[PDB]
Design a protein around this ligand. Structure first.
Ligand SMILES: Nc1nc2c(ncn2[C@@H]2O[C@H](COP(=O)(O)OP(=O)(O)NP(=O)(O)O)[C@@H](O)[C@H]2O)c(=O)[nH]1
Lengths: 69, 133, 61, 709
């Protein structure tokens, strides 16, 4: 049971939004754009450790500042 | 707060899980996929699941050991239990299978010693009409 | 009146609109009229190719 | 009033107003037209002075059972007010109304909440991709709560539903509404529409509503940066916000909430502005796909009068003097007086998919079963339907909905286009009636005109499936319920003057045996010279269902010349057809015969003697043994929530419904399969609507026959 929290966007905003859409289904360019802008929504909850750290690696590769315990 | 016994290899059943899961706000699809993954890793027999609920509608699944009745059925090699227990015997089990199921029930149960689970499974075999030897 | 229905196949079921015509048939002693094929509810007979106009069947394509 | 005139589809709106039974759509349309100058004063169906509720049955039952069209062009944009019935028994009328329009409006009550039939209506209106704008009415009632209805709408159909105008009033006689995007409250304390900036009583609440609406609209809008600018310290430009709202409506993804005081005219002008600006244009609207005659794909026609011709007839009327006036749903091309178009009957092969027992494709009419037709006709008189009156118009541009009089072949859904390039617009979902009711024609002229009357009815209501049973030669009418059957009977006894006699529905039954039996057939008939003496012995046993009729001949010695055995078989078949259950038998099916003895004479007995011998032999065999009466069983599709599972399937114990599985559609809805003989399915519609409280539908499919117990 892990909750993923994203802290910023950076210089790679488009890639961050795309990868955020890839991680969790149901978000568009605009909804996830607003989410990473601020809109603090806890996207995924109680996910497994492998999902958490793969999302961490993908988001960091996208230029996003994410924290995974 | 409900519990069910359901086949391992298939999710979204018609009779047992559907309506009871539905009237509790549990997401059907996510539970189905997670249970199917766990039961494809298991691949032994059907598994019983307990449903625990929260106020935030999040669902947690509790997966126990394979049912003792089903384990005795596979150990005796027969599929359907005896229609007249203690009056007609369909199969016989040696103590190796009974003790393996006793270790299973030790892992899943409150029993302090394997002998307690062995006598539990012997009682189950009596209930089915299956001799323990 | 009783009217004969020419052709091999007729769609007519009980109490449907038709168009009767004069005509004699020996085999039926009391029949004096014929039903025109291809008018009102009556359908021109199917698979008909020769002497088509008598049976109300359209030309093939 | 003045005729609404538009010369471009983007200046035309096609709105099929939808709502529950007791929706007040007719009064709302009257108020909208009174605002637009079509009517001087608004009428009420209670008085009977309305426009849409012109039919006799609408006044008779005090609720809209037949659709109507009202035309009104304000601010240069033509708005077509298509009122639609809300009753469950007229789902096809509303389906056709949607299919002949580019927009839909949900008009509900503020003092009453949403019931399951209206939930099903919203579900269907979703799977057509129609932008639905929520209209809150019945504000005059003391129990009216716009906020409660809006909260329930935002809870049920997602948070995407966002209010556009927020009313300000006492809750009984509301004094007006607030313009959120426009920052302008419209007061009616004097009875006149005064667009003014709000005094500031709820200025914080006004700002909250504006921000919520902006986030709901911008998040769907193309420009991602709009929300960032709004949150960055800049107030978004009003024109940009209005354009975003129009575009969001155009995607059929946004559901604005527009409360209207239909009792006092408050909310009418703003709703008209909403229609004029936010509604998608028919060229931008997703037109129904257009089929070539043989099924090859074709791009949908451009919604332009300059483009190729395209239209569709979706209604039909009647008149003593003038004739038939049929509505036309024009998608493309220019309609001009005294022109020739193509009248296509859906090319019923497209709608030939299944159809239950009757295989209803389009317009039925067993004499001309399925539409499937191609007709080229000169058009009659152009007109715009305004209740019983029809306003003529010189030209019909693309996207507009018109009605032509003096027609003969026009039927509901008949695609109209150029006769050189004929077209079949995709037929909408056609609901099969599931309540077969038998009738009998009192006189000959009654049924002789009944064919024409039912063809006209299908031209008005294709949901009426008709299939005349050939076995008992009694016409059988299928309906959706008491409302549909009542409307059909009223129109039949009034619109064409046909006297009717309702009779019990007849269902057939067969004969099969229970075990092996032997039969003896003797023929003796004095003739004087060459004998007439036949003694046949047979042996008949039952056969499994579908195994047909098996005949075996085992005459020892060959006393019967071989040309007489077919006469024996013919007599056996005749006895099977007449029946063997006592003296009032039924056609025997699925039995095997073994004729193992015979005798003959050649000169006299050609066929009849051995036919009678075989009939007596089969009578002797079947009387000695047992027999069975076979009735049919069908597969039943039942989808009810988890709570109605027990309430239904326990009653099926008294209704002999054997369950096979309670498949889980999702959380609550559960798919139930059971095989029930058609005996119990005679009145299941009313019973179902009773037990499920108007929240139950079913399907029926014939499976096989079963012995009767
Ligand atoms: N008390 C009250 N009666 C209303 C209201 N709106 C309509 N009615 C009543 O309902 C009848 C016609 O209105 P309504 O049912 O909404 O329109 P309809 O065309 O008959 N039905 P539908 O809305 O489904 O098309 C009349 O008897 C009228 O008095 C309302 O807000 N309050």
């Amino acid at each position: 049971e892990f909750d993923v929290i994203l802290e910023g966007a950076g210089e790679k905003k488009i890639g961050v939004i795309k990868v955020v859409r890839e991680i969790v289904s149901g978000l568009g360019l605009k909804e996830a754009k607003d989410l990473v802008d601020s809109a603090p929504k806890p996207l995924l909850e109680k996910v497994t450790k492998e999902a958490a750290d793969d999302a961490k690696a993908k988001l960091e590769a996208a230029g996003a500042s994410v924290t995974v315990k | 707060l409900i519990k069910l016994q359901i086949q391992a290899g298939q999710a979204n059943p018609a009779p047992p899980v559907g309506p009871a899961l539905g009237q509790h706000g549990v997401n059907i699809m996510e539970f189905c996929k997670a249970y199917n993954a766990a039961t494809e890793s298991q691949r032994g027999n059907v598994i019983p699941v307990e449903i625990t609920v929260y106020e935030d509608r999040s669902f947690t699944f509790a997966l126990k050991t394979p049912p003792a009745a089903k384990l005795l059925l596979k150990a005796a090699g027969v599929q359907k239990g005896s229609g007249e227990p203690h009056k007609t015997k369909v199969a016989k089990v040696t103590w190796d299978q009974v003790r393996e199921i006793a270790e299973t029930k030790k892992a899943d149960l409150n029993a302090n010693d394997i002998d307690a689970a062995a006598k539990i499974i012997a009682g189950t075999a009596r209930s089915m009409g299956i001799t323990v030897e | 009146v009783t009217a004969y229905i020419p052709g091999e196949g007729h769609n007519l079921q009980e109490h449907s609109m038709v168009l009767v015509r004069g005509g004699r048939v020996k085999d039926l002693p009391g029949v004096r009229y014929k039903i025109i094929r291809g008018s009102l509810d009556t359908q021109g007979v199917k698979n008909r190719k020769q002497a088509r106009s008598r049976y109300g069947a359209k030309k093939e394509k | 009033g003045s005729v609404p005139t538009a010369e471009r589809p983007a200046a035309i709106r096609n709105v099929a107003l939808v709502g529950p039974s007791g929706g007040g759509k007719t009064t709302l349309v009257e108020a909208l037209l009174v605002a637009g100058g079509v009517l001087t004063r608004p009428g009420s169906v209670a008085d009977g002075s309305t426009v849409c509720d012109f039919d006799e049955a609408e006044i008779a039952q005090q609720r809209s059972v037949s659709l109507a069209l009202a035309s009104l062009s304000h601010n240069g944009i033509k708005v077509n007010l298509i009122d639609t019935p809300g009753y469950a028994d007229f789902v096809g009328e509303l389906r056709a109304g949607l299919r002949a329009a580019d927009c839909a409006l949900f008009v509900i009550a503020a003092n009453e909440t949403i019931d399951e039939p209206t939930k099903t209506l919203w579900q269907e209106c979703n799977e057509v991709q129609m932008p639905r704008a929520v209209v809150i009415t019945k504000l005059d009632h003391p129990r009216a709560n716009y906020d409660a209805a809006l909260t329930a709408a935002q809870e049920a159909f997602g948070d995407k539903v966002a209010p556009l105008y927020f009313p300000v009033g006492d809750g009984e006689s509301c004094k007006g509404v607030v313009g959120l995007l426009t920052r302008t409250y419209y007061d009616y304390s004097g009875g006149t529409h005064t667009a003014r900036p709000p005094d500031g009583s709820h200025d914080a609440a006004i700002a909250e509503l504006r921000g919520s609406l902006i986030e709901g609209v911008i998040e769907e809008s193309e420009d991602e940066t709009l929300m960032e600018r709004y949150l960055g310290g800049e107030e978004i430009d009003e024109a940009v916000l209005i354009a975003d709202l129009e575009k969001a409506v155009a995607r059929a993804s946004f559901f604005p909430v527009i409360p209207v005081c239909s009792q006092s005219g408050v909310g009418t002008l703003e709703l008209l502005d909403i229609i004029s600006r936010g509604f998608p244009a028919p060229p931008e609207h997703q037109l129904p796909e257009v089929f070539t005659p043989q099924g090859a794909p074709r791009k949908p026609l451009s919604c332009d009068p300059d483009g190729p011709l395209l239209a569709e007839v979706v209604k039909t009327t009647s008149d003593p003097y003038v004739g038939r006036v049929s509505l036309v749903r024009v998608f493309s091309g220019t309609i001009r007086p005294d022109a020739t178009v193509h009248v296509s009957g859906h090319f019923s092969a497209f709608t030939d998919t299944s159809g239950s027992h009757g295989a209803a494709a389009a317009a039925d009419g067993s004499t001309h079963s399925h539409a499937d037709h191609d007709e080229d006709e000169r058009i009659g008189t152009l007109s715009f339907p305004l209740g019983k009156q029809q306003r003529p118009a010189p030209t019909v541009v693309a996207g507009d909905i018109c009605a032509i009089g003096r027609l003969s072949r026009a039927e509901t859904g008949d695609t109209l286009s150029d006769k050189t390039d004929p077209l079949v617009l995709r037929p909408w979902t056609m609901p099969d009636p599931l309540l077969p009711i038998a009738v009998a024609p009192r006189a000959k002229t009654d049924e002789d005109k009944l064919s024409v009357g039912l063809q006209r009815l299908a031209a008005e209501d294709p949901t009426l499936r008709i299939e005349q049973n050939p076995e008992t030669h009694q016409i059988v009418l299928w309906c959706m319920g008491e409302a549909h059957a009542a409307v059909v009977l009223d129109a039949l006894s009034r619109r064409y003057g046909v006297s009717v006699d309702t009779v019990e529905l007849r269902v057939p039954l067969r004969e099969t045996f229970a075990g092996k039996a032997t039969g003896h057939g003797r023929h003796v008939k004095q003739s004087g010279g060459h004998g007439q003496y036949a003694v046949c012995d047979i042996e008949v046993e039952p056969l499994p269902e579908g195994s047909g009729f098996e005949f075996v001949d085992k005459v020892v010695g060959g006393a019967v010349p071989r040309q007489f055995i077919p006469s024996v078989e013919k007599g056996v078949r005749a006895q099977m057809e007449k029946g063997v259950t006592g003296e009032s038998g039924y056609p025997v099916v699925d039995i095997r015969v073994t004729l193992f003895d015979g005798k003959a004479h050649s000169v006299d007995s050609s066929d009849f003697a051995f036919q009678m011998a075989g009939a007596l032999a089969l009578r002797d065999a079947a009387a000695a043994t047992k027999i069975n009466l076979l009735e049919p069983v069908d597969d039943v599709t039942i989808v009810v929530p988890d709570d109605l599972v027990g309430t239904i399937m326990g009653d099926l114990s008294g209704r002999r419904g054997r369950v096979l599985g309670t498949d889980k559609h999702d959380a609550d809805r559960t798919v139930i399969k059971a095989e029930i003989p058609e005996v119990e399915l005679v009145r299941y519609a009313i019973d179902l609507r009773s037990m499920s409280h108007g929240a139950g539908q079913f399907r029926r499919s014939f499976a096989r026959y079963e012995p009767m117990p």
